[PDB]
Amino acid sequence: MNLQRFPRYPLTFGPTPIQPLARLSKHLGGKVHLYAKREDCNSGLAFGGNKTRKLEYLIPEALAQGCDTLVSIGGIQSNQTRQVAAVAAHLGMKCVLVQENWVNYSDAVYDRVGNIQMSRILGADVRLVPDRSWEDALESVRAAGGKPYAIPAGCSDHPLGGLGFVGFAEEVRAQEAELGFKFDYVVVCSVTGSTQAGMVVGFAADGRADRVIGVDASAKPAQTREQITRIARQTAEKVGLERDIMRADVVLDERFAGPEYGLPNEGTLEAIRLCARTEGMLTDPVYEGKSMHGMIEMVRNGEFPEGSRVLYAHLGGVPALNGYSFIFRDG
Amino acid sequence: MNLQRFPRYPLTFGPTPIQPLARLSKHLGGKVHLYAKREDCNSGLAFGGNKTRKLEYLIPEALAQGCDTLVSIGGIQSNQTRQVAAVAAHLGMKCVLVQENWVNYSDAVYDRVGNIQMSRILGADVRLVSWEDALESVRAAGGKPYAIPAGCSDHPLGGLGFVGFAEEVRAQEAELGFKFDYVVVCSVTGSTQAGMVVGFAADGRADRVIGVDASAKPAQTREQITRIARQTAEKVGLERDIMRADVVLDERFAGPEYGLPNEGTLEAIRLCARTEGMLTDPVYEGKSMHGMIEMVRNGEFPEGSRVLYAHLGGVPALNGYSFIFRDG
Amino acid sequence: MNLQRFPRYPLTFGPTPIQPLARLSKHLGGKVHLYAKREDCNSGLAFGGNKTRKLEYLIPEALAQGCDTLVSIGGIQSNQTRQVAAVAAHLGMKCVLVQENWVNYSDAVYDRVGNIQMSRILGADVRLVRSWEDALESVRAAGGKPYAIPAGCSDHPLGGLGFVGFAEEVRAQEAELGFKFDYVVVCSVTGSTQAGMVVGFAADGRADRVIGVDASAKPAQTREQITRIARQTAEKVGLERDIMRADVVLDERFAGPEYGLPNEGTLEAIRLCARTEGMLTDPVYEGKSMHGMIEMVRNGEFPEGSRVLYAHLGGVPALNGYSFIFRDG
Amino acid sequence: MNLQRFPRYPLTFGPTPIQPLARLSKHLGGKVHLYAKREDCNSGLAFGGNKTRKLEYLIPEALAQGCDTLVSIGGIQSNQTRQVAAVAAHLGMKCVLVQENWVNYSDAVYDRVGNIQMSRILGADVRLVPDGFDIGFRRSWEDALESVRAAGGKPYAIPAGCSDHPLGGLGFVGFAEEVRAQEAELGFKFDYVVVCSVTGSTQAGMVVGFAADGRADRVIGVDASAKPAQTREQITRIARQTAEKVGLERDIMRADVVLDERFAGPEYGLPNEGTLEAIRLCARTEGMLTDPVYEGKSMHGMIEMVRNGEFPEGSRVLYAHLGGVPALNGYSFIFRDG
Ligand SMILES: *Cc1c(COP(=O)(O)O)cnc(C)c1O
Ligand SMILES: *Cc1c(COP(=O)(O)O)cnc(C)c1O
Ligand SMILES: *Cc1c(COP(=O)(O)O)cnc(C)c1O
Ligand SMILES: *Cc1c(COP(=O)(O)O)cnc(C)c1O
C-alpha cells in the first residue's frame, strides 16, 4: 500500500508511545501481557486524542479547498467536536459545532464542563439543538461569507477519515521492530468506526486485520460493524491494500457496550477504577472505560492465549469524566 | 554544577516539546517571538504537568527509604495532589492527600470534578479539611509515609526537577540553533522557578527567568523561591551565590487572590486558546499567560526577543470554574 | 370512629386551604371541576408537607417516652427526612437521618441541593450509606434515646392518623363550602397518606373515591401497604367496618419508569399545571399524581359535573435535583 | 390614611401568621422576645413571599388596563421575578423576565436551580444575558417592553422588586394594618420590627403603615444592598410618595427611616460568616430557614442587636420573614456540611 500518497498536516507531537501495563497484567494473573499506545497524549491541542490523528489527513484538503471554517458535530460531551475546535483555533479557522443530545443522561453541568467547556473557550460557535441543524450550520457559514469544511461524526464517514489509523498500524510495526516482537492483538473502542477501520486496513497489510479486536461502545453493533466494514474497504482501496477486507476481518465484540451509548454499566466503572489504581492511567465512562472493561474481561476469561501481547489503544476521552461527577464522588 | 549525582525516576515520556506560538505572536504585533515548552503534556499519568517533572527526583528517595505511601497536600483543585495520586498508583504505593479550602471560591461541584475527581478515581485517600496528623496517620496504621510538601517545593530535592529543565532547554536551543532570551513561568510554592533560576544561572541567564506570581502574596513566594534556589544551587554545586537580582517575580497579574482570576486572566485564557488551540487555567497558567501577553503588549520585551513560555499544566481545574465560561 | 382519642402536636398553621383550579379545569374541557388542598403550604417548618401532618400524631409519643433524638430515613431527596429534621430543630431534639440512594439517578448536585441541603442546615446528622438499626443503636450507645420514624412515617402505629384527620378536615370544609367533593387524588408511595384518607373517608362511605396514584413503580407492594396500614388504622380509631381491599383504589398507569424518575407525561403535567395555575409539582411525586388527574379528566374517566380534590402533598424542593431536565423550562 | 381606597387582588392565603421564636429568644438570653410574621408562607404560587403581597395592589391596575403580559426584572436568583412568573401564570397572562447576573458570584448551577428554575417551569420567557452584556447599560428593560408590543401584546411594567412603582408601597402599608389587628389579640404592641431592605418599598410601606400610629422609627430596616445610602434614600422617597398616596396626614421625617448598615457585607448577594452563623442558629433553634442573600442578613441583624443589648430588656421584636429561601440552592457548596 501507499498512505504516503496523501499529505499529512502535523497536529500531533509525533508517534505515540507504547507502555506496558505490568501492574494490571500481573493483577489479572500474569498470563497475558497488556500494553497501551497513548493516542490520548498525542497532542498539545486541548488534550487531542484519536480524532486528532484522523484530522491530520483531512486538514490538507480543507486548506487546499480554501475553506475558512471547520464544521462538525456530536453529543454534548463529544471528544470529536472539542478536537475540531482546538485544531481550528490552531489553524486560524472559525469553527461551528452542532451538539446534539445523544445520551439519556441529565447531569446538572453536563453541558458546562469537560469537552464542551473547552470548545467554547477555544472560541467555537457551539450550537445546542433545542430541547437540520447540520445543514443550517453549513449554510450559516456560507451566508456569512465563509467556506465550511464539513467534518462528519467522528470524522469517520468521510473519504479521508480512515487514513489516520492506517498510519497507526504503520507506527506499531516500526515500534515492534525496536521491541523485537509483534503484538498478538489490538483492543480498540469503536463507535463511528473509522479508527478501527484504519487499523483493519493497516494491519491487513501484514495479515493481522482480524487481530484488531474492536469493542463496541455504540450499543448498536450492527450499524457500527457495518460502518467499520464499509469505511475499511473504502480506505483499503484509497491506499492500495494488496488484499481485500473480508467480513471476518472486522471483529467487533458487543458485550461491553451496555446499557446505552454514553452510559457506563458497573463493569465499566470497575475497569476504570482497576486500571486507574494499578497504572495511573485514566479511562472514561463513555468510550475507553468500555474497551478497557472488555480487555480485562477477555484476559479474565482466558480468551487471550497465555503469553499473548495485547496492545490497548487509548483513544482519549478522559475530560468527559467531568460530566459524571456523582458516580465518582467517593472515587 | 552536577545534577547527574541525583537519580531520576522516569515518570515522563521524555524531554518536553517546544512549540512556536506564531499566531499569538503575530496577533500581538510580530515584534516578539513567543514559544511554549509543554510541561503540561509530559506524562501519561493523569495529564502530569510541572509537578511530575519534580517528582522524578523525589521518588528514588521514597523508594530508597522503603516507603509504602505517598503523602501530600494542596487546595481542593490542586494539580500537585492529583499528580501524586497518579505517580503513587503507578508505583504501586498508597496515597493520602490533604485537600484544604485554599480558595475563597464557591462552586457547586468544586470538590467533585477536575483534579480532585481524578485523585479519587486513582485510588487516593482524599481528606478534606493538618499535614502532621496525616503523616502520623499512616505511621499509626503501620505504613511508611513519604512526606511531600505543597508543590514538592520546600524539600531538599524539590528543586532538582527544574534544574533539569534548564539543562533540557540548553540542548534544545543547540538543536534549534538559537537561544531563548527569556522564559516566563508561573510561581506559587517556588521550586519550579527556583530550579529554573539555578539551572539558568549556570549560563548567566538566571535574571532572564521571568516568574509571574499567582499566589497574591508576592513577598512570601519571592522569599521562598530565593531560599529554595539557594539550597538547590548548593545541592548541585552551582559555583556562585543566588542574589536577589537572579530572582525576578512580577506581581502585577496575581489578582485578586490565589485561585481567583481577574478579567485579564480570563481574556488571556481566551486569546491564547483561540489563537493557538492551547488551553490555560484560571488559577495558574492563565495568569502567567496574561503576564506574558501584557509584557509583549507594553513592549517590555526588546524587539526581536524569543520568549519561552513554560506551560506547567493545570487545565483540568477549568472544570471547577464552569459558570464563568458558560458562554465562552 | 374516634380520632380525638389521640393527641396531636401542632406543627402546622392549622387546616390547609382548598383552592379551585379554574384555569386547569377550563383548559381540559370544563367538564370536571378541579380543586387542590394545599398540604404543601401547611407549615413554617422548612416548607412542610404531608409528612408534617403525619408527624403531629407521632411527636406526642416521642415526648411522652422522653426521647431526645428523632431518627428517620429516606432517599437522597427525601421530603420526609427534611420535615423530620425541621420538626426536630423546632422541638429542641437531635436528628439522625439515614439517607439512601433509592433512585437510579446521578445528578452532580443531587446530594447538595433541595431537601438534603435543608436537613444539613437544620442541624440534622445526615448519614449517606444494618444501616437503620445501626443508626438507632448509635443514638443509644451515644447516651441518647432515639424515637424511630420509619420511611414516610408510614409503617408506624401512629402513622395513619394524620390523614384520618385530613378527612375530618375536608368534611368540615365541605360544610363551609356547601358542597362535597366526589373524588380525591393523592400520590402514594409508602402508604399511610392514602390509608389515613381511606379510613377517614370510609367514615362517610367515600374511601373508594380516594384515587391513589402510584409513584413507586412497584404498585403491588404499595397497594398492599396502603391496605395493611389502613386496616391497622381503621382499627386503631375504631372504625365500625373492616377495611376491604376494594376500599383501596390505586392507579398504576403514571408511576413510570421508576421511582424517582419522571416520564415525558410527568414533565408535561408539571408544566401544564404550573403554567395554568402557578402551582408547582415535582418529578418524583406530585407531578405523577397530577399527571394522573389530568389524564383521567382528559380521558373522561371522571363523570361530568364531578368535583375532584387534588391533595398536593409537597415535594417541590426536589425540583433542584433535576435541573438539567428543566434548563429551558 | 385610607388604604381601602385601592383595590387588592387576592394572591395570598389571607393575613400571615405570627409565631414566637421562643427557642432562639431563650438561647440569646431570654431578655428580648423575638417573634416572626411569615410573609414567606403567604401564598400557594411558587412559595410566594413579600413581593407577592406587593403584587396584590399592582394587578388590579394591570387588569384594568387590559394588559396581557407581565414584564419584570432582577438578578439570576431574584425572588421577585419568580413571584411575577407564578402570578402571571395564575392569572392567564404571559410573562417576560429580563435577567442578568447582578452578583459577583458564579456557582455552577446558579442559573438553573432555585428561583430561575421555577420561573422557567412556570412558563415565563426568561431573558438571561451573558456576562458583559449589561441590561442596565443597553436598556434591555425597555426593549423587552417593546418586544411584547411589537409581538401584539400589551405589557404591564413591573420595576425591580415592585418598589419604584406608584403602587409598590401599598402592600406593606396593609402589613402594618394586619399587625395592629393581630396586636389587638395579643393584647400588646411590638416594640420593634426587623425587616430586610434592598429595593425599599417593603420597609417603605411599613414606615407609612406604622407612621399612622407613631412607630415608623420602630421599623428597623437591615440593609442587604451593601449600598446603604442609595437604599436609605429609596425607602424615604417611596415612603413619602406612598404616604401621600394613602392620605397619611404626616410628613415622613428623615428620622422615621431606620436602616442599619452593619450586616449587609461584603456585597449584595454574598453572605458573610455572620450571615451563615445566623442562618444556622435560627434554623437549628426554630426549624425556620432563611437565605444567604436577604433574610439571613436581617436575621444576623436581629440576633446581633439582641446579643449586643441594643434592645431594651423585656422588648418584643417582630421579625418579618420576607421569603427568599429557594435561593439557597444556588449556594450549595457553602452548606455542603450544613
Ligand atoms: C470517537 C472516540 C472513540 C470511537 O472512535 P470511532 O472512530 O468513532 O469508532 C473511542 N474513544 C474515544 C475517546 C473517542 O473520542
Ligand atoms: C503548582 C503549579 C504552579 C506553580 O508552581 P510552583 O513550583 O509551586 O511555584 C503553576 N502552574 C500549575 C498548573 C501548577 O500546578
Ligand atoms: C411521601 C410523599 C408522597 C407519598 O406519600 P406516602 O404516605 O408515602 O404514600 C407523595 N408526595 C410527596 C411530596 C411525599 O413527600
Ligand atoms: C425583595 C426581597 C427583600 C427586600 O425587599 P425590598 O422591598 O426590595 O427592600 C428581602 N427579602 C426577600 C426574600 C426579598 O425577595
In this structure, what C-alpha cell is assigned to residue C172? 368540615
Main-chain dihedrals φ then ψ at residue D173, nearest 5 degrees? -75, -45
Q: Which residues of A touch C328 (CB under 8 A)?
A: 131
Other C-beta atoms closer than 10 Å to the C-beta of B150 total 23
Helix and strand element counts for chain A (H, E): 10, 10
Q: Which CATH architecture does the domain made up of C66-155 adopt?
A: 3-Layer(aba) Sandwich (3.40)
C-alpha–C-alpha distance, residues D161 and D145, integer Å: 17
Beta strand spans in chain A (E) = 18-20, 33-38, 69-75, 94-100, 125-128, 148-150, 185-190, 212-216, 251-253, 309-314
Nearest atom of ligand 4 to the alpha carbon of D163: 7
The answer, for B128 touching chain C at a CB cutoff of 8 Å, is no
C-alpha–C-alpha distance, residues B232 and B154, integer Å: 10
Q: Given the C-alpha cell 537561544, which residue does it identify?
A: B179
CA distances from D221 to B322, D263, D271 (A): 36, 11, 17
CB B98 within 8 A of CB B127: yes
CB B178 within 8 A of CB B187: no
What one-letter code names the amino acid at B129? V
Closest to A84 in 3D by CA, of A152, A140, A145, A137: A152
Q: Which chains touch D (3 or more CB pairs under 8 A)?
A: A, B, C
C-alpha–C-alpha distance, residues D71 and D85, integer Å: 9
C-alpha–C-alpha distance, residues D304 and D196, integer Å: 14
Other C-beta atoms closer than 10 Å to the C-beta of B200 total 24
Instruction: List Cβ neighbours of B29 (8 Å cut-off, separation of 6 or more).
Output: B296, B297
C-alpha–C-alpha distance, residues C5 and D64, integer Å: 53
In three-state secondary structure terms, A126 is strand
How many CA atoms lie less than 13 Å away from D262 in the CB half-sphere? 12
C-alpha–C-alpha distance, residues C225 and C190, integer Å: 7
CATH of domain D66-164: 3.40.50.1100
Check whether the bond before A221 is cis (ω within 30° of 0): no
Other C-beta atoms closer than 10 Å to the C-beta of B143 total 15
Gap from B112 CA to chain C (nearest CA, Å)? 8
Report DSSP letters for D105-147, one per residue: ---TTTTTSHHHHHHHHTT-EEEEPPTT--HHHHTHHHHHHHH
Report DSSP letters for C53-112, one per residue: HHHTTTHHHHHHTT--EEEEEEETT-HHHHHHHHHHHHHT-EEEEEEE--SS---TTTTT
C-alpha–C-alpha distance, residues C193 and C313, integer Å: 9
CATH number 3.40.50.1100 given to B66-154: yes
The answer, for D72 touching chain C at a CB cutoff of 8 Å, is no
Length of chain B as a residue count:
328
C-alpha–C-alpha distance, residues B277 and B273, integer Å: 5
Q: What is the DSSP letter of D73?
A: E
Pairing relationship of beta strands A33-38 and A18-20 according to DSSP bridges: antiparallel
| Bridge partners of residue D72, in order along the sequence | D97
In this structure, what C-alpha cell is assigned to residue B288? 502567567
C-alpha–C-alpha distance, residues D169 and D163, integer Å: 7
Q: After which residues does chain D have a break in its backbone, defined as C to next N over 2.5 Å?
A: none
Pairing relationship of beta strands D18-20 and D33-38 according to DSSP bridges: antiparallel
Of A78, A190, A194, A218, catalytic: A78
Q: Given the C-alpha cell 422617597, which residue does it identify?
A: D237
Q: Which CATH number fits domain C1-45+156-329: 3.40.190.10, 3.40.50.920, 3.20.20.140, 3.40.50.1100?
A: 3.40.50.1100
C-alpha of A74 from chain center: 13
C-alpha–C-alpha distance, residues C320 and B323, integer Å: 17
Q: Given the C-alpha cell 510495526, which residue does it identify?
A: A173
C-alpha–C-alpha distance, residues B137 and C44, integer Å: 46
| Bridge partners of residue A71, in order along the sequence | A96, A150
Pairing relationship of beta strands C33-38 and C18-20 according to DSSP bridges: antiparallel
Please give the class, per CATH, of domain B1-45+155-328: alpha beta
Q: From the CA of D196, which ligand is nearest?
A: 4
Q: Across the interface, do D106 and B327 touch by the CB < 8 Å criterion?
A: no
Minimal Cβ distance to A325: which of C108, C323, C324? C108
What sign results for the dihedral spanned by CA atoms B126, B130, B131, B136?
negative
C-alpha–C-alpha distance, residues C51 and C191, integer Å: 11
In this structure, what C-alpha cell is assigned to residue C97? 437521618
In this structure, what C-alpha cell is assigned to residue B280? 490555560
Q: Across the interface, do D113 and C117 touch by the CB < 8 Å criterion?
A: no
Length of chain D as a residue count:
338
Cα-to-centroid distance, B50 and ligand 2 (Å): 7
- Pocket lined around ligand 2, Cβ cut-off 6 Å: B 49-51, 79-80, 151, 153, 186-193, 284-285, 312-314
Q: Which CATH number fits domain A66-157: 3.40.50.1100, 3.30.420.110, 3.40.50.300, 3.90.1010.10?
A: 3.40.50.1100
Cα-to-centroid distance, D106 and ligand 4 (Å): 21
In this structure, what C-alpha cell is assigned to residue A255? 458485550
CA diameter of chain A: 60
What sign results for the dihedral spanned by CA atoms B307, B313, B316, B321?
negative
Resolution (A): 2.1
C-alpha of B196 from chain center: 11
- Return the number of CB contacts < 8 Å for A and C: 26
C-alpha–C-alpha distance, residues B320 and B282, integer Å: 10
Length of chain A as a residue count:
331
CA-angle at D23, arms to D21 and D26, nearest 5°:
105
Ligand 2 binding pocket mutation candidate from B47, B52, B102, B186 (most atoms within 8 A of CB): B186
What sign results for the dihedral spanned by CA atoms D149, D151, D152, D156?
negative
CATH of domain A1-45+158-331: 3.40.50.1100
CB A115 within 8 A of CB A102: no
Other C-beta atoms closer than 10 Å to the C-beta of D337 total 7
Q: In what order do the strands lie in the sheet with A69-75?
A: A125-128, A94-100, A69-75, A148-150
C-alpha–C-alpha distance, residues D325 and D333, integer Å: 16
In three-state secondary structure terms, A172 is helix
C-beta pairs of D186-189 under 8 Å, 24+ apart in sequence: D186/D18, D188/D316, D189/D215, D189/D316
CA diameter of chain D: 61
C-alpha–C-alpha distance, residues A166 and B268, integer Å: 38
C-alpha–C-alpha distance, residues D295 and D276, integer Å: 11
C-alpha–C-alpha distance, residues A24 and A296, integer Å: 9
Q: From the CA of B149, which ligand is nearest?
A: 2
Q: Is the CB of C190 under 6 A from ligand 3?
A: yes
Length of chain C as a residue count:
329
Main-chain dihedrals φ then ψ at residue D330, nearest 5 degrees? -85, 5
Closest to C99 in 3D by CA, of C123, C80, C86: C80
Q: Which residues of B touch D109 (CB under 8 A)?
A: 108
Report DSSP letters for C299-316, one per residue: TT-S-TT-EEEEEE---G
**Helix (H) or strand (E) run with residue A161 in it:** none
C-alpha–C-alpha distance, residues A157 and C292, integer Å: 46
Q: In what order do the strands lie in the sheet with C69-75?
A: C125-128, C94-100, C69-75, C146-149
C-alpha of B327 from chain center: 28
C-alpha–C-alpha distance, residues A94 and A71, integer Å: 9
Q: From the CA of A285, which ligand is nearest?
A: 1
Cα-to-centroid distance, A110 and ligand 1 (Å): 19
CB A290 within 8 A of CB A254: no
The CATH 3.40.50.1100 portion of chain B extends over 1-45+155-328, 66-154
Instruction: List Cβ neighbours of C57 (8 Å cut-off, separation of 6 or more).
Output: C6, C7, C8, C9, C158, C159, C161, C162
- Torsion angle defined by CA atoms of residues D331, D333, D335 and D337, in that order, rounded to the nearest 10 degrees: 170
Q: Which residues of A touch B278 (CB under 8 A)?
A: 44-46, 90
Q: After which residues does chain B have a break in its backbone, defined as C to next N over 2.5 Å?
A: 129
In this structure, what C-alpha cell is assigned to residue C67? 426521647
The answer, for D106 touching chain A at a CB cutoff of 8 Å, is no
Nearest atom of ligand 1 to the alpha carbon of A155: 7
A150: left (phi over 0), alpha (psi -120 to 50) or beta: beta
Main-chain dihedrals φ then ψ at residue B95, nearest 5 degrees? -155, 130
**Experimental approach:** X-ray
Q: Across the interface, do D287 and C45 touch by the CB < 8 Å criterion?
A: yes
Q: Across the interface, do B106 and D108 touch by the CB < 8 Å criterion?
A: no
Closest to B278 in 3D by CA, of B12, B39, B14, B31: B39
CA diameter of chain C: 61
CB A40 within 8 A of CB A317: yes
C-alpha–C-alpha distance, residues B65 and B91, integer Å: 14
Cα-to-centroid distance, B289 and ligand 2 (Å): 13
CB A76 within 8 A of CB A323: yes
The CATH 3.40.50.1100 portion of chain A extends over 1-45+158-331, 66-157
What one-letter code names the amino acid at B78? S
CB B39 within 8 A of CB B309: no
Of C25, C43, C78, C192, catalytic: C78
By the 10 Å C-beta count (0-12 exposed, 13-18 middle, 19+ buried), B295 is classed as: buried
C-alpha–C-alpha distance, residues B47 and B69, integer Å: 21
CB D317 within 8 A of CB D25: no
Report DSSP letters for D7-67, one per residue: -----SSSSPPEEE-HHHHHHHTSSSEEEEEEGGGS-SSTT--HHHHHHHTTHHHHHHTT-
Q: In what order do the strands lie in the sheet with A18-20?
A: A18-20, A33-38, A309-314, A185-190, A212-216, A251-253
By the 10 Å C-beta count (0-12 exposed, 13-18 middle, 19+ buried), C328 is classed as: exposed
CATH number 3.40.50.1100 given to D1-45+165-338: yes
Pairing relationship of beta strands B306-311 and B248-250 according to DSSP bridges: unpaired
CB A187 within 8 A of CB A312: yes
What sign results for the dihedral spanned by CA atoms D54, D58, D63, D69?
negative
Please report which residue ranges of A65-110 form alpha helices under DSSP H. Answer: 79-91
SS (H, E, C) A230-258: HHHHHHHHHHCCCCCCCHHHCEEECCCCC
What one-letter code names the amino acid at C81? T
Residue A78 is among the residues annotated as catalytic for this protein: yes
